[PDB]
Amino acid sequence: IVGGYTCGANTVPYQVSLNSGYHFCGGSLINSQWVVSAAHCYKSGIQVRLGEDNINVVEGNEQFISASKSIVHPSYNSETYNNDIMLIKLKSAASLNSRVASISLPTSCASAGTQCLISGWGNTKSSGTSYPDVLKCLKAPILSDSSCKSASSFIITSNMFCAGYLEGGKDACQGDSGGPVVCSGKLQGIVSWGSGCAQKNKPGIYTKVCNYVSWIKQTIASN
Ligand SMILES: N=C(N)c1ccc(C[C@@H]2CCCC[C@@H](Cc3ccc(C(=N)N)cc3)C2=O)cc1
Numbered sequence: 001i002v003g004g005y006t007c008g009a010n011t012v013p014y015q016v017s018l019n020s021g022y023h024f025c026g027g028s029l030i031n032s033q034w035v036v037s038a039a040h041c042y043k044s045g046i047q048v049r050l051g052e053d054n055i056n057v058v059e060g061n062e063q064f065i066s067a068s069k070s071i072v073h074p075s076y077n078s079e080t081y082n083n084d085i086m087l088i089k090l091k092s093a094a095s096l097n098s099r100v101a102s103i104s105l106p107t108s109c110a111s112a113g114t115q116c117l118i119s120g121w122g123n124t125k126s127s128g129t130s131y132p133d134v135l136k137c138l139k140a141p142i143l144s145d146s147s148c149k150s151a152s153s154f155i156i157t158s159n160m161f162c163a164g165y166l167e168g169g170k171d172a173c174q175g176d177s178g179g180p181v182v183c184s185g186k187l188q189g190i191v192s193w194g195s196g197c198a199q200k201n202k203p204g205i206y207t208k209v210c211n212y213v214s215w216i217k218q219t220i221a222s223n
């Protein structure tokens with residue numbers, strides 16, 4: 001997260017860190033047994049880390065639980081990032097508490113201008129590299145598709161939205177991948193892609209979760 005702020009320990013209790021010996025992606029807890037992340041975060045050997053703030057220090061509220069199954073969206077395309085979404089089932093149910101909590105799925109989509117909270121342990125620099133150890137947060141509005149497309153020349157689909165600031169300085173970044181965009185209490189986005197971070201006319205691109213709620217619900221019910 002570039003140009004954000006330190007969230008405060010466990011103030012985003014649905015945020016998880018996916019760990020394969022090191023943090024490599026974010027994710028969102030959606031019930032005690034399931035996490036939602038980006039399909040581009042797919043790999044084997046995922047341990048889900050819940051209740052984290054400092055990912056390098058055991059602070060006392062963590063739960064580490066291995067993934068039993070990962071399900072990449074049936075139509076994920078790794079070239080275009082269309083349908084950039086994946087479910088991860090936990091080997092054992094998380095113990096839900098004030099620091100480990102699920103986030104509600106949308107009942108409808110969010111509209112341009114709605115403010116959202118984006119969070120993660122990704123790079124905090126627009127130039128070069130610095131990785132934080134504590135969770136970072138950013139408030140950012142959804143942008144209209146038309147303004148996003150004209151400003152950036154990005155090719156996006158109806159399954160993506162843009163959020164952030166066209167002037168630059170505030171954005172998600174590498175390492176935030178797979179993490180939450182929460183708007184008005186609902187998980188509307190997943191950190192998906194972009195160009196650089198916090199660059200002018202290059203806003204963040206997010207998977208449009210409202211389009212996938214039916215798939216999420218049916219997949220969880222059947223697995
Ligand atoms: N055409 C595409 N769909 C496309 C373009 C570039 C990339 C690679 C890169 C690098 C590889 C890791 C995935 C992803 C990480 C990322 C996340 C957020 C932001 C941001 N909000 N500024 C930037 C980058 C990315 O966009 C992937 C997909």
Ligand SMILES: [Ca+2]
Pocket residue numbers: 052053054055056057058059062
């Ligand atoms: Ca920790």
